[model samples]
Target chain A: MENVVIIGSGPAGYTAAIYAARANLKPVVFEGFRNGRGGQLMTTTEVENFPGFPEGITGPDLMDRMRKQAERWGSELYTEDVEQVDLSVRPFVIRSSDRELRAHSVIIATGATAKRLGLPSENTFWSRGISACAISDGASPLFKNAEVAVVGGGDSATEEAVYVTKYAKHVHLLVRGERMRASKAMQDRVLANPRITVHFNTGIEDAFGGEVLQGLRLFDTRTGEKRSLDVQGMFYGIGHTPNSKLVAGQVELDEAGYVKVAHGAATSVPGVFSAGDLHDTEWRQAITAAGSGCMAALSAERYLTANNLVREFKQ
Target chain B: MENVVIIGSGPAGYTAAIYAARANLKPVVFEGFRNGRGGQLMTTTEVENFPGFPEGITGPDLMDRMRKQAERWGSELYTEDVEQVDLSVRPFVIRSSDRELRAHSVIIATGATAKRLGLPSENTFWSRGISACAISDGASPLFKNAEVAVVGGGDSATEEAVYVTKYAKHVHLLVRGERMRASKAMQDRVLANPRITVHFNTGIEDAFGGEVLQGLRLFDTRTGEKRSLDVQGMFYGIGHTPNSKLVAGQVELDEAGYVKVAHGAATSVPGVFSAGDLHDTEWRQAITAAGSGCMAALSAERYLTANNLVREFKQK
Candidate 1:
């Protein structure tokens, strides 16, 4: 049986791999296939808040460096998705594409995915002009000198609307409710901004564009009146859906579908740890994920050592 | 009143400052004085396990970058020690050198200090060849191909003894007891290593050296027989004492005098969080501390926002 198997390839998984590999744990990391790879940061442009990088680094570049560091410390990587996991027995069983793997410990780092508007046009212009994160897609020159629209009425929407104003000529925040769900301070800031215009009780009906996004169709929630606004970009700040489907029934999940860790990273089951966006609904920064990943590795190491299974899978 | 006040300038404190400042908390940090600044990393040399920095960077350099990052986000720093803290009341009051600071939330990142054998000669050979952390000082040229002594028989001592063999010619593990306190696997590794010679029932009497650390005088714990060995370095892998003196009576502490924090970084008292070495007895790595600092900042942010105190201290 392998010492540890990390299921994900974000800051948390790679960091767990680094610590586990350095401790001679011989960790195997599944970097994932399909729509998953480097967590949310992979789609992000520049990460300014991860710390240690005083000057911001591109999200992909940071993950690449972290992956390299983990590999340098002797961590094995498999760029595939884990089909199934059985945590009910000793040496937990994990089924991949063509092989079944067992490990004394497992770290779950499958991150969360942002919720899109589900509009058919969203898939048509996914990265072309529509985005879920404003900070990541707001800096595009296509949005500069052009009107953009931000959907949702929460803190993220307000924050995004405030941030997108630096690039867009004007930002129209479409709120489906009469009152915002954001904190008073954030709402105050958003209301105080001149470049932002909040359309109360309004929602986006459809996104219209030819080759790229050019405008958005809106509808009033109170009335059935429909209107169209000319815009070059649209950002969805609704929320996220934690990727807890793999362990939905196996591990305990909170109401939001995120894995519920006991304290640091230990999950509801023994020999199983969860980190990163999959577990942390708040403070979903890369640095926090990395830190939780380290904690998971250390916790796993302690668990292994305490069980006298530290050398079972040593290379 | 300030939004948040971080005590100590370790990885945890600085990291908390960074997060809180970035979230517009405007944290004011009191980076302590008189053997209390930078926590444990300031005395450390090369840090190979901090993650990020694939080539490894010096401890001081790592701390400098974190401090700069925290400051860049508008975290004000006062290079003075916090004299007293009153966590018994709202708007926590902190007395520093010449000022009394008040904050709605407080993050205590005051890290721990490693215990040292109180030998008189220890003062002379401090850092010249003596260190408490072997991993940080083992790679120094002074101990290259030279016999060194490691005190204590715990897991850290065994780990340090095993680590020093990468550069040292031989390691003499002086255990002042009949058996080692380390785990079975660690004890087996120490016993199986040929370069490590375990001296049971032995203790260090004095560190005898001239210009630098030349050797150590050892005495048998059972027989009291004394002897000296020629060496270039000595490491104390005993343990650490958490710096929770300031909040001893005000906050909850574990049996080891470390701050007792709840699930993440929240202390027993509301609006107060503790992170880093002060609260974490195990997994005391810089990365873990930095992570806890982030947790503390987030917890503090939530507390402030929930209580509608986020706007009271804006740019205060």
Candidate 2:
């Protein structure tokens, strides 16, 4: 039995492993396949907000550095995803594709995927012009002096639109409702910004561009009119689907499906802990997620040591 | 009223300001002049553990870099200490040493300080050859091939001693009591490590060697005997004193004095929020504190928007 097992590979998972292993817990991490090896960093380019590096670093490069540090401190790494997890009891049993492992404590950093507009061209322009988060990716130079459109009607959508207006020449907000679902303050801010234009009862019909995004097509639900706006960026503030079905019954969840952590990174269950975007309904940034990961790992290690749950494998 | 007011300037506070200002909050940061930056990166020399840097960066260098990034977003920096706060009403009022400021929302990232032995040499060797945290700073190469001593008798002490043994040539744990205060399993691990030696009823009498730590003097409480060990490093695991005095009466504190922010960052009062070491006792690291700092700001933003508290300031 391992002292600690981290499910998923992201800032939270890797960071947790680093803290736990350094504390002599000898954590074992199941990073999964290509799906693993660090969460969103797999697709990230430049991370400027993570402390220590003023110049910022590429996404994959940051994860690579974290992985090396965790491995150097005696944490074991795996490549396959776990097929089944039995958190029904202590000393949780997890079965991967080819091996079965048991751990006294587990950290769930599986994270969540942002819901996109389901456009085929979105993948081609994933990191280039198409982004799921506006606050984190809106300031990119790709949209500087260019046209940008944000899709959604909630506070996040309006907030993102207002945020993007800082650089974009023409900023459009595609709301599917006559009015906005956002609060009065958010609606007022977006409506008050001179650079932002609100398109009521509208939704993104299609993304029109070449290999890279150059514009998007919008359809008005009320007027039944279609128009194409030239832009270099399309940000989605619609919401995300958290991959938390595994521990739904075992953990407390918020209205939006994000896990509820009582003490930053602690789940309701003693041995089962959570971190990253899955547990955070707000501030879904990479640096914050990495911080929560460290918290989860440290808490899990302390719990394991208290319960006499630590065990080392011969391998 | 300021758009955002960050109460602490540790990794979490600075990181929060970096994000908030980038998002156009125009955050105002009140970095406690010399005392409030927290201890994680305060005395560190080489920090290889934080995810981004592979080559490792010095402690002060890391803090400086974070501060620079925060300032790049046009954050108005204030060098003062917050004396009191009133979060009962909207536009939370905060009084500093020089002036009083109000904000649409506030992020409290005040961090805690670890309790240390009142040894003059201990102060001199801080981040030089003496450390209180093992996971982050003790893992540095300063203790490599050299003997070290850990002072404390609890689980943290035992774990810290074992962690230092990974790099130190030899690790001696000085317990003030007959047996360790750590849980049984942790005690077993500490007792089992061949590189670690435990001394019961022993306390640090003093320390020797200026400039660089050469040895630590010890006294046996049971026999009234004194001895000295030539160790280059000394780590304290006594525990920590969370800095909740500012908001202690406003929030729900845990048994250990850490604020309680369940589900999300919440306190007894609706407008008040706590983050970083002030509310956390389990994981005391730069990244973790920064993470909670981000959480506090976001939570405060949501609360203000929800209650219609975020409004334009009326000129007085």
Candidate 3:
């Protein structure tokens, strides 16, 4: 049995491993093979707001630094993905495909995965003219006074539609259905905004551009009529799916699949702690996630100490 | 007038400046003249656990980088200390000795001060063998299976006494008063631990060793008798004093003078946000404080944007 088992290799997971390893917890970290180590940060580039780097560090570079720090403190890391977790038993059971392990405590930092439209040009225009988050990328120089399209029907889509209007000259809110699933107040905000244009029964098939994104091939979902919308950017205002499926039934999660945590990173279970986007729906920044990871590691350390479950080492 | 005025220049304050400046808030920062730029980290040596630096960075070096980062994105920093803050009026008033300024929003990152023994050898042995935070330094190789002493009589002291037992072979908890000021439950835990020896009415006079701290000079408060204790470590658990006197009456403060903040870093005032150790009573690490700073900056931005109070090229 290990002192603590950390799931995920995002900023939160690695930072938790850093703190836990320094505290002599000897944490075992599963850096996740499916998402291929690091979290959403790996997908993005030039993280300007993570604090220390004055010039802004690349997402991979930052993750490498955190991983090195955790490793320097003697945290055992793995590249395997966690398949199942059993929290009911003492020394909780954790299983990947090749191995099964038991830990006294666990810190879950598995971040949320943003929903995306599976298109061919999405790979070409990723972060070029396409973005998953409007609040993070809307203020970029690329979208300044340019026309942009926000796709989705939920609150995330509606909010992003209005949020992007601050930088873009005009915003097109494309909903696949006839109506949006957003709240009435949010819908009112979008409808009332003069810069935003709502397009119902619109579905995007492909995004094509020369070197960067030029326009999107959109289709009418109701009549199957194809059309093209010329825009500089396409932002997926679609909601995020929290990566809490591994411990779904074992832990208490909200309706949106986010793990429900009390104040100070404590989950419903005593020895189980959740951090990062796994538990936080609001303020899901890298700094916030890293902070929560540190809190989770400390809370796990305290729980282990208070419960007299630390170090089964023979004197 | 500035869009946001940040007080203090610690990791928290600088991090807040970096965020707010990047978001085009064009923050004005008061780095504090008395304590100078940077907070508790400036007093310490190498910071090993700030998460990013694998080889570890010196406290001053880390502070310099953060300051540069905040400045690179256009954060105006001042060395002068803030004398007064009027949160009662619209567009909050902030004044130093040189000038009086107004702000649409304020972020208070004024950190807490760790209490010290003020001994003669304390300056020499600070972080040498003496540490203010036991959780951060207790697991060092220097304290492995060694004898250590913890000073003070509060919950912080009692907590450290028991915590040091995990690495130390024997622990001594020295109290200046006749009885410990910690809670009954905490005192009971200290007494229950076999490795800890609580000495009542004991006062620490000085700490002296060869190069690093090897022991401390002790005295009985009642009898004034002198004694020497040979220990490898000494942790100050007395407590911390939050540097919030400037905003004491204006902001809601606890008895300990820490700024009282609601969830998400909002203080009692609408446009005021407090971060770092000024509000957090527990988990006052650099990473935690930096995280709180980011939250405070974001909250302040939201408040400014929602109220349409964001300035257009202010403080020119």
Candidate 4:
């Protein structure tokens, strides 16, 4: 039995473990595989804005450092994906594919995954050229000094296209609808921008390139026109799909599948908390995830105190 | 006119400046030369939980790297504090002791101060033996196998005492009141712990130690008793005073002077956002501060979009 069991080893889970372990909670974390351990950030390249590193740092390096910091303070890490969790019990029971554990507190940092096009080339050049998250991966170092194409017509698509226009030589926004579905102000801003060319009733049919994404074949639904644009960066701002199916009936998630919390990291259920991209969708970044992790740990520590769980660890 | 003006120079302020300038915001920072930059973290020795270093990192070293990162991103650093501000107009005007400047958007991350005892020995043993926060500073190598003392009768005080009991050989809770101000459960936990001893109506008169804190002299109110305990660590959990004095009336501040925000970092006033310890008293941490900074910037950027200020900043 453990005091706390954290699932998923992203910026959130590692940060929560840091706080929980430091507070003498001795949290046991199921880090899952290498990809599960770090969430979407592991696939990222350079991370320039995570606060401490004034010089630009990589996402994988930052996640590794955070995980090490958590373990140094006495957090146990397991490299297995927690497939089933039973929070209905007093001390939550979490069972992974290869490990079994029970805990009084559960911190759910299982981050969300953005939907992808399922193209082999898209997966190959994920952080290189093809990125599902427009604002985060599209405007990164890979998109600089290159021609890019944004696929979507929502607020994020327009906003990301405008953001990419600063670095990319040219930006083509592929709108699937006849008219832009964004807010009027966003639509006006996109239309006013000379660098951004908005194509109506259009979407990316195929992404083709080698080593780096070179071009995107576009299909115009309105005119039945097919054309190819020479571009090195392709961003999917269509939307995101939160990975909350595993805990569907187990906990309280918001309308968008985000875990609801009162203040800090205190969740609707006692001894259970959440952090990072799984909680805050708008400001999904490494620093934000770490911050919420700190809050979750502090909250869990206080929760233990309020519930009279502060006893000497029987290690 | 300035492109951007950062109110404080902690990790959040510098990190925002780094992002804003890397996005070519041409940011300018007011580091407040009166006390210099690097808010409260500058007073500490080591920072083992900032999440970028596997081995323990010093507080000053981590903060210095953030400052340099802001500089590398083309953010101009200013050494003066803002004496007054005029945010009613576009391209907000700010009057400082040194000069006057204007900025399109502003980021306020002034941060909060953990209240500490002002004894001479306390100052000498600041990061040596005495610390305001236990979770961040107490769990270091210095306090191992030694008795620890906590000052304050509130929830935080009792909580820290119980926390230190797990690591320290002995834990002492020093409260100014006969009855503890902590909750029923917290009070019971402290009372039930065998390693913890509560000294009511008592406080430390002076802290003593050379390179490291050795012990402290205590004063009692009931019988006017006085004595000293051989303690290696002392933590103050009294309360925190958020640094919202400058922007108190300018923005929406809470009862204890924390900047009030709706969802993200947007304050009542548009284009002005608060981040880090200034807005959060519950979790005053490095990662939390950095995360709030990102929200503040993203909120500020979104607000600019709504107000068409991006077009205002751009030349036709």
Better of 2 and 3 by lDDT: 3
What is the TM-score, restricted to chain A, for candidate 3? Answer: 0.96
Better of 1 and 2 by TM-score: 2
Clash count, predicted structure 2: 1
Candidate number that wins on TM-score, 2 or 3: 3
Sorted by TM-score (best first), the order is: 4, 3, 2, 1
> Which has the better DockQ: candidate 1, or candidate 4?
4
Per-residue lDDT for B1-316 in model 4, tens only?
Answer: 6656788888778767766666556677888767558777888888877777778777788888888877876677887788877767878887778888877778888888888888767778988988887878767778886888999898889878887776788888988888899999789888988998898898788988779999988878777789888899998988988888778788888898999987768888777888888998677887788788778777766666566565222101
Calculate DockQ per candidate and list them: 0.31, 0.45, 0.56, 0.60
> What TM-score, over all chains together, does every model reach?
0.81, 0.84, 0.92, 0.93
List model 1 lDDT by residue over A74-126, tens digit each: 79898899988998888999888967898999999998888888886777876
Descending-lDDT candidate ranking: 3, 1, 4, 2
Task: Evaluate candidate 1 and give its CAPRI docking class based on DockQ.
Answer: acceptable
User: What lDDT does model 1 reach?
Assistant: 0.82
**TM-score of predicted structure 1:** 0.81
Give the C-alpha miss distance for residue A214 in model 3, angstroms. 3.5
Q: Candidate 1 residues B1-316, lDDT tens each?
A: 7888999898989988877776667789999887466777876666655666666677788888888878876688988988899998889899986899888999999987889998978878877888886644665667878899998999989978876776688999989999999999899988888999998999888898787899888888888999887788899989998999999988999998999988589888998999898998777778888888988997997788657676432222
Interface RMSD of each: 4.0, 3.6, 2.6, 2.3
What value does the lDDT take at residue B289 in candidate 4?
81
The 10 consecutive residues of candidate 2 chain A with the worst lDDT sum are A306-315
- Candidate 2 per-residue lDDT over residues A247-311, each given as its tens digit: 77778888777888876678877788897888876677787878878878878866765665655
User: lDDT by residue for model 3 over A1-315, one digit each (tens)?
Assistant: 898999999989998998888777889999999877988888777777777787778888999899999998878999989998999998899998879999999999999988899898798898888998775677667788899999999988998887677678899999999999999988988898899999999999999998878999989998999999999999998888899988889889999899989766899888999989888777778888898899999899888988878873311
Worst ten in a row by lDDT for model 1 chain B: B307-316
Judge candidate 3 at residue A312 and give its lDDT: 35
